[PDB]
């Protein structure tokens, strides 16, 4: 790609594993069944962009920016988000993931306010010092994914299953949670559920 | 019922004896049983209760000052309003000293006692009040708990599998190790402000 600005294109089907992307700006375009295992997006300008049935195993981003991005059936493992660059002016719903795989990703200390992490498997990602309001895990599996000091104020767990947030360290005020995985809240408390 | 005359009696059996309001003072009862006996407000005054079993008795109101109950198993009783802070508690600090099963207990004092291993199972346990009381290990299996207050109740290992319209608050109490069952066990959640569905 010799071109810094993109708008309005369809990449399709394209292979670009490995390959490192800088410094480009794409606006409205979308990405879909394209490969970009272990690529690199160095300093990049995502802006109302989508990713639909793409693979970004292990993808790096550091420096590169997104905003308005969605991720749609997209393999997405291992990305550490924390060296993305992110604004000091914070905004709502900035990104959003349906039916992705997101296991062992970093989200560590950063601002997801109202973000969809929805019906996205979501194994042993790291959720640490984030901000999660109004977030939203409808029908998310969260199996081994760490919250610690993590808000999750206003947040949707809805028929999600396997998370684990101890109360004690967590803020969950006006959450919502759907029985009967709902009364694993209770395991901060070392109750015997049966 | 003809007025006890001894303060001792052992191995014996008292059946459909009506002693409603007698009053009974200082008598030791070792492995006996009362079946079928009216005690409604008897005063049991500094007696002692060892290795007994009361079955189908109404002790409704009975008032228990410095009366002691050890290896006391009540069944099918009626017990109604009874102050149990006033009777004798041991020093001696042993688990299981007290069993109830299909019970009334309704309206009865347990506040600040020691009651750990305490059965209470398939009784009717309304508006009872167990502040501050130690249940350690206090089986609840399929008791009804409506009204009833649990206000820092030592619950730790307690066993309330099957029961209902038990009010816990969770942040109130000891509950670690406590054991509950779903649906009912939804109800500690209550503790939290979350939206549930």
Same mark, same amino acid.
């Given at each position: ?8 294109? !369809? ?12 410094? /480009? ?52 493992? =291992? ?34 306010? =109202? ?7 979501? #194994? ?23 919250? #610690?000091?993590?808000?999750?104020? =206003?947040?949707?767990?809805? $028929?999600?299953?396997?998370? #684990?947030?101890? /109360?004690?360290?967590? $803020? ?11 009364? !694993?809240?209770?395991?901060?408390? $070392?109750?015997?559920?049966?």
């Amino acid at each position: 790609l010799e071109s810094k600005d993109y708008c309005g294109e !369809s990449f399709v089907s394209e292979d670009r594993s490995g390959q490192s992307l800088e410094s /480009i700006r794409f606006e409205d375009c979308t990405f879909r069944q394209c490969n970009f295992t272990e690529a690199e997006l160095n300093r990049c300008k995502f802006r109302e962009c989508e990713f639909v049935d793409c693979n970004l195993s292990l993808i790096s981003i550091p420096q590169t920016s997104f905003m308005e991005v969605r991720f749609v059936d997209c393999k997405m493992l =291992g990305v550490n988000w924390t060296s993305a660059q992110w604004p000091s002016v914070k905004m709502e719903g900035a990104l959003s993931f349906e039916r992705c795989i997101l296991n062992d990703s970093l989200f560590y200390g950063l601002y997801l306010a =109202g973000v969809k992490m929805v019906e996205c498997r979501i #194994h042993d990602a790291n959720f640490t010092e984030a901000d999660c309001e109004d977030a939203d895990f409808t029908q998310s599996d969260l199996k081994g994914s760490t919250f #610690h000091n993590t808000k999750l104020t =206003g947040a949707s767990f809805i $028929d999600a299953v396997n998370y #684990h947030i101890d /109360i004690f360290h967590n $803020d969950i005020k006006r959450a919502r949670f759907s029985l009967p995985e709902a009364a !694993s809240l209770l395991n901060s408390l $070392d109750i015997e559920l049966s």
